[PDB]
Design a protein around this ligand. Structure first.
Ligand SMILES: Brc1ccc2nn[nH]c2c1
Ligand SMILES: Brc1ccc2nn[nH]c2c1
Ligand SMILES: [Cl-]
Ligand SMILES: [Cl-]
Ligand SMILES: [Cl-]
Ligand code: NA
Length: 333
């Protein structure tokens, strides 16, 4: 028999109850703007599918960020545009301002409202205990929002979190790998960066959901509270699961494989071995102990589960005791 089917525990049917047009991004008609409204100021960085620039809107002298959509299928372009339009105005989600094409090269570009080019990876190994809780809560607002809107990000990692630490403001960026969640859909498992890939991607379980983002978030949290970058440091996608298995243990891994009737790639048979589930205390030392609390470990434990169904949802995560002081201070402000 094949793999056992899976459904998201939350927001399962939200796209089914929308109009077709909400999620049928292949049918979306983009009104392409004029590239000449903007002047590029400077390169901010060059990614995999994108070059990103600081630019000026020469109509209002407003600073913007421009992402030139490096050669890729039109299908992927429409998907990213439609997701950005659907999520526009959501909490801590980057704001799409315009969509333009080069009159010559015909190359699409996305224009975003300005954010400083300071990503979370530059700051997240130097935060106080309170600021880790604060910024994790801000990321959870973006994830509960996009999940509630029927969208999984699929590339949650520190390089995709822009922070203005001065203004205590955060935006979740790079929606290029994001997808709409549809119950029973089998997704590409070649998404996310190696260190943030959930076990579902590593064992090739395709019927995954929003809970993939919650694994990635757990990898970020573990990195920050233990000052260990990355937390799960695999050589390649096979060794990545071994690094996880040495922490979470093999018993829960094989129970997860049995539960979903997953056919494990033969390469895994000699490399996973047999490992106890490690107590989180093993990762605590004199230079991280100020970031580690019972509350932090209880929360982390509930994100980092093999079984995607077991993991906290974004809204359940926001209700965890780890965030009580953040929630109280927000209500006061
Ligand atoms: Br938006 C934008 C503005 C000017 C540009 N020059 N090359 N590519 C561009 C994209
Ligand atoms: Br603003 C901004 C900066 C970089 C980005 N990469 N993808 N989306 C982005 C938005
Ligand atoms: Cl990163
Ligand atoms: Cl490791
Ligand atoms: Cl132990
Ligand atoms: Na401590």
């Amino acid at each position: 028999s094949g793999p056992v089917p899976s459904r998201a525990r939350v927001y399962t049917d939200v796209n089914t109850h929308r109009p077709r047009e909400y999620w049928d991004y292949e049918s979306h008609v983009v009104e392409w703007g004029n590239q000449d409204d903007y002047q590029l100021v400077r390169k901010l960085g060059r990614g995999k599918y994108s070059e990103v620039f600081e630019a000026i809107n020469i109509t209002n002298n407003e600073k913007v960020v421009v992402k030139i959509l490096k050669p890729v299928k039109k299908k992927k372009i429409k998907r990213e545009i439609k997701i950005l339009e659907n999520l526009r105005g959501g909490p801590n989600i980057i704001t799409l301002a315009d969509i333009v094409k080069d009159p010559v090269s015909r190359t699409p570009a996305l224009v975003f409202e300005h954010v400083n080019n300071t990503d979370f990876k530059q700051l997240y190994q130097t935060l106080t205990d309170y600021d880790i809780r604060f910024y994790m809560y801000e990321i959870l607002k973006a994830l509960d929002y996009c999940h509630s809107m029927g969208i999984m990000h699929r590339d949650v990692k520190p390089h995709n979190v822009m922070i203005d630490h001065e203004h205590r403001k955060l935006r979740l960026i790079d929606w290029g790998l994001a997808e709409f969640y549809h119950p029973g859909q089998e997704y590409n498992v070649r998404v996310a960066s190696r260190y943030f890939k959930g076990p579902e991607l590593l064992v090739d379980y395709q019927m995954y959901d929003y809970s993939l983002d919650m694994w990635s978030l757990g990898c970020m949290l573990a990195s920050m509270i233990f000052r260990k970058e990355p937390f799960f440091h695999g050589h390649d996608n096979y060794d990545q699961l071994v690094r996880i298995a040495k922490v979470l243990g093999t018993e829960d891994l094989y129970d997860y494989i049995d539960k979903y009737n997953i056919e494990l790639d033969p390469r895994f048979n000699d490399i996973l071995g047999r490992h106890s589930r490690k107590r989180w205390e093993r990762f605590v030392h004199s230079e991280n102990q100020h970031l580690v609390s019972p509350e932090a470990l209880d929360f982390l434990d509930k994100l980092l589960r093999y079984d995607h169904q077991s993991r906290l949802t974004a809204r359940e995560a926001m209700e965890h005791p780890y965030f009580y002081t953040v929630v109280k201070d927000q209500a006061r402000m």
